[PDB]
Ligand binder design. Structure first.
Ligand code: UTP
Lengths: 146, 300, 161, 123
């Protein structure tokens, strides 16, 4: 409310509120594991370096893709987002538990590092008449894809 | 119902008029506290400027003998909402109006207000964007233009606002006599016992060369202008914060008056609609007539 | 409708010593170093102050005679009774010295000599020197020479110590 | 997909423009940021570009109607959203058809403005 006029200053609470208010957009219901993981990542600051426009794309890669496996860097033994049966383990054991907390942070840290290094870097370097349109279409598709 | 929602729309606008004004209060409570540093670092630059120009003269003899032009340089704010500062300054200027009055007001509001009100005395005005700090260069720009407006001027007078405290903003006047009249008074303060406090100061200037004296005169004149604009800014931000409180309360009173009419309207609307329905119900009951009862009355 | 003069709100006036009065032995000079209506030092007791006026350098100690000095772009030294030194650099202004033991040095700009950079000062002189060669007219050359004088004074001031 | 995306962007811009209008009303257009004024300038063109003269309302309007194709509308709005026509005068979008009519009206506006300037110049 005070931000609207006066050049909003981006404190950490604001840096994370915007991501939360931009993860809330969705078209189809989200599987519990995908939703809880994404909220946890934004809660601990893994998206502070991610622009608000690319949050949906970041979430899509986290859910439907695996950057660590793509670049041969993943070290987690069992905690992978493609294991859809981890949902009940997460329900029984909270994310803030030694069983899952260690691997969860490792995956989020690795995924965040790869995304910033490879994808967002190219996004900020888009200068063309067709690439911009392709990027815009991609972001809109990811908005209603997860 | 539209009538009820008319009030709701009206209150909807009022409810956000407050938010925009509330954000403005926050904006103007940053700049007030940013310019509060002057409060600490003022009241010491103008010490020998007092001796140069401090002359508690009468308010009639100094304007009745206006042999040459008198150049007034009122200080006014660019943006409105400041309060009564500009209005008072205009009253202070209206009270001095003369045949030999030339105006070089400062600020967009000053230009617009003084251009329309006194149209054959206004010449042109100075405008500064409130982007940088009030510096010496701006003051030098005020003085240079003032001289070119009327070089053969009896006096150049700056009418500004002094910020005594957060809630006190008085009107102050720096009067700068031109070189000829200043050096004449400086000559009398030196030779004569009159003006004792200025005796040593005047003789210490007459010993030096003339160009130094002229530079001294211009330099201290600039400082006086710099103090006035600096103070007028601090009074401006302080006044706006106060004014932007008055608007909040006015917008709160309206919110309490349009809410009552909204809550009074819904109560009346419910009552009237219900009354209409019951009137129709009674009309259809009244028109109805019971027929002859076909029962065995004898067997009772 | 009489208006107050802007000096009535200022409560620190200048005290002048009547000429027909006994002398006092003073060991402290009350210095007031000011920039753009802001005092860097306020009635601050200093042992001595060294200032560069147009004629030359003046070393002002307590009891110095009444004088007005037109400063030039140059360093200014302030030495406290501790013997500790504080060096500023000024671009211009005036210095009023009173026989009562006060010195009010009002400058357009007064910056500690530490803040100034010698590397920046040197490259800037080179740029203005090229302009002075190609400076269109006499007025432009005079303005450029004003900058060079200040720059060389700054460069010389820092090279001194 | 392009049709859906363009429509949503238009709606969002119009919604934002209405909120910014309150600030323009209270603070003024000057106090809006660089981004906000670009939304304002683009949104106003959208508001006027939605208008269209119908072939049956010639008597009411006094101008010939236009029949805009679906593809032309999508492309015209898509370019407007991304600022392809930021330099076009605002009134060029008022009571016209496709983008081509906008350019023609802007050209006509430029010509008459030049004539007025020439008349003033002679004076
Ligand atoms: O031909 C002259 C004579 C005098 N003067 C000027 O008149 C003034 C007389 O100054 P003073 O007589 O009061 O003192 P002083 O010689 O000690 O002055 P400084 O060099 O210490 O400043 C000085 O400022 C001197 O430069 C000239 O400029 N030209």
């Amino acid at each position: 409310a005070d931000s609207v006029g006066g050049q909003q200053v981006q404190t950490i609470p604001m840096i994370r509120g915007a991501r939360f208010v931009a993860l809330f957009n969705q078209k189809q219901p989200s599987y519990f594991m995908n939703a809880i993981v994404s909220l946890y990542a934004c809660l601990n600051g893994y998206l502070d370096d991610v622009k608000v426009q690319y949050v949906k794309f970041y979430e899509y890669l986290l859910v439907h893709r695996d950057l660590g496996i793509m670049y041969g860097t993943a070290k987690n033994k069992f905690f992978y987002m493609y294991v859809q049966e981890l949902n009940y383990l997460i329900r029984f054991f909270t994310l803030n538990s030694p069983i899952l907390h260690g691997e969860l942070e490792e995956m989020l840290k690795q995924h965040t590092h790869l995304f910033l290094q490879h994808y967002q870097s190219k996004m900020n370097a888009i200068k063309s008449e067709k690439d911009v349109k392709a990027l815009k279409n991609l972001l809109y598709s990811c908005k209603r894809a997860v | 119902s539209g009538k009820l929602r008319l009030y709701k729309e009206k209150l909807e606008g009022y409810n956000r008029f407050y938010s925009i004004v509330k954000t403005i209060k926050m904006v103007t409570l940053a700049k007030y506290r940013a310019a509060q540093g002057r409060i600490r670092t003022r009241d010491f630059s103008l010490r020998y400027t007092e001796l140069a120009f401090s002359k508690p003269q009468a308010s009639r003899d100094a304007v009745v003998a206006a042999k040459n032009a008198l150049v007034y340089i009122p200080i006014t704010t660019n943006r409105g909402s400041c309060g009564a500062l500009n209005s008072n300054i205009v009253r202070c200027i209206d009270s001095v109006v003369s045949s030999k009055m030339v105006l070089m007001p400062v600020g967009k509001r000053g230009i617009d207000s003084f251009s329309k009100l006194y149209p054959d005395e206004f010449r042109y005005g100075i405008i500064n964007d409130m982007k940088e700090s009030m510096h010496f260069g701006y003051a030098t720009f005020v003085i240079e233009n003032a001289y070119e407006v009327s070089k053969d001027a009896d006096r150049y007078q700056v009418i500004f606002n002094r910020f005594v405290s957060a809630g006190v903003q008085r009107n102050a006047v720096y009067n700068i006599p031109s070189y000829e009249k200043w050096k004449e008074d400086l000559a009398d303060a030196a030779s004569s016992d009159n003006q004792k406090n200025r005796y040593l100061f005047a003789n210490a200037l007459q010993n030096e060369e003339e160009q130094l004296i002229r530079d001294f005169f211009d330099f201290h004149a600039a400082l006086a202008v710099l103090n006035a604009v600096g103070e007028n800014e601090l009074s401006e931000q302080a006044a706006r914060l106060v004014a932007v409180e008055g608007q909040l309360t006015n917008i709160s009173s309206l919110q309490q008056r349009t809410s009552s009419l909204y809550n009074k309207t819904r109560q009346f609307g419910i009552t009237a609609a219900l009354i209409e329905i019951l009137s129709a119900m009674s009309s259809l009951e009244g028109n109805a007539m019971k027929g002859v009862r076909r029962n065995k009355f004898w067997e009772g | 409708h009489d208006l107050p003069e802007g000096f009535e709100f200022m409560e620190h006036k200048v005290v002048n010593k009547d000429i027909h009065a006994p002398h006092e032995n003073l060991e402290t000079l009350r210095l007031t170093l000011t920039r753009q209506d802001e005092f860097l030092l306020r009635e601050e007791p200093v042992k001595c102050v060294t200032v560069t006026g147009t004629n030359g350098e003046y070393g002002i100690y307590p009891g110095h005679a009444y004088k007005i000095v037109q400063l030039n772009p140059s360093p200014l030294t302030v030495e406290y009774t501790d013997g500790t030194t504080k060096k500023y650099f000024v671009s211009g202004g005036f210095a009023h010295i009173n026989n009562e033991g006060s010195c009010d040095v009002n400058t357009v700009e007064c910056t500690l000599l530490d803040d100034l950079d010698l590397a920046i000062a040197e490259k800037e002189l080179a740029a203005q020197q090229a302009a002075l060669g190609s400076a269109k007219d006499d007025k432009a050359k005079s303005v450029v020479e004003i900058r060079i004088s200040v720059i060389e004074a700054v460069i010389a001031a820092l090279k001194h110590h | 997909v392009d049709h859906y995306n363009v429509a949503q962007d238009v709606v969002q811009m119009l919604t934002k423009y209405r909120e910014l209008q309150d600030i323009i009303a209270v603070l003024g257009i000057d106090e809006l940021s660089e981004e906000d004024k670009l939304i304002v300038d683009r949104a106003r063109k959208l508001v006027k570009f939605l208008s269209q003269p119908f072939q049956v309302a010639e008597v009411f309007t006094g101008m010939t109607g236009h029949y805009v194709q679906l593809d032309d509308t999508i492309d015209s709005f898509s370019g407007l959203l991304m600022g392809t026509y930021d330099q076009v005068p605002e009134m060029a979008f008022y009571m016209v058809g496709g983008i081509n009519s906008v350019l023609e009206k802007a050209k006509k506006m430029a010509e008459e403005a030049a004539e007025l300037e020439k008349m003033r110049r002679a004076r």
